[PDB]
């Protein structure tokens, strides 16, 4: 996969408040490129909301709100510390929860290694530790560098 896999590392992370889009969606939807919503929830950051970002701004992907299990329905959010609800329209606003997470990192082309980090997390917990389905998400920590951060029980 031409990718740096860091490792994953379980830990305490402080909670953070975070505002972007939200779209409302499926694995299965994702899965079928003719109706998934992701990319285009991205595409619409870039639009109107990467603009308005400074060079402090952290960026995000929520995945929270979940229906039931990974089987269900989520909220997947594009989303920045820095933006408010206020500077950008038909925003909302979330906090993520303190908490206890495992945390996978790697770095490599982009966005080839997002979603081959989600994978590492599926064969990880498909194990050691339960998902809490409350708040998961992926931190843009650089250009090539990506964690995600599962809540755990």
């Given at each position: 996969?031409?990718?740096?896999?860091?490792?994953?590392?379980?830990?305490?992370?402080?909670g953070?408040?975070?505002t972007?889009?939200?779209?409302?969606?499926?694995?299965?939807?994702?899965?079928?490129?003719?109706?998934?919503?992701?990319?285009?929830?991205?595409?619409?950051?870039?639009?109107?909301?990467?603009?308005?970002?400074?060079?402090?701004?952290?960026?995000?992907?929520?995945?929270?709100?979940?229906?039931?299990?990974?089987?269900?329905?989520?909220?997947?959010?594009?989303?920045?510390?820095?933006?408010?609800?206020?500077?950008?329209?038909?925003?909302?606003?979330?906090?993520?929860?303190?908490?206890?997470?495992?945390?996978?990192?790697?770095?490599?082309?982009?966005?080839?290694?997002?979603?081959?980090?989600?994978?590492?997390?599926?064969?990880?917990?498909?194990?050691?530790?339960?998902?809490?389905?409350?708040?998961?998400?992926?931190?843009?920590?650089?250009?090539?560098?990506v964690?995600?951060?599962?809540?755990?029980?």
């Open positions: 996969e031409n990718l740096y896999f860091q490792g994953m590392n379980i830990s305490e992370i402080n953070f408040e975070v972007g889009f939200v779209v409302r969606t499926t694995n299965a939807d994702e899965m079928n490129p003719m109706t998934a919503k992701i990319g285009n929830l991205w595409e619409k950051f870039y639009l109107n909301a990467a603009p308005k970002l400074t060079d402090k701004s952290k960026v995000y992907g929520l995945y929270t709100n979940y229906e039931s299990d990974f089987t269900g329905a989520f909220d997947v959010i594009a989303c920045s510390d820095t933006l408010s609800p206020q500077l950008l329209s038909e925003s909302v606003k979330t906090k993520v929860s303190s908490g206890k997470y495992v945390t996978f990192s790697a770095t490599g082309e982009m966005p080839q290694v997002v979603i081959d980090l989600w994978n590492e997390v599926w064969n990880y917990f498909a194990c050691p530790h339960k998902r809490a389905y409350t708040t998961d998400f992926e931190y843009y920590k650089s250009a090539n560098t964690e995600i951060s599962i809540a755990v029980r």
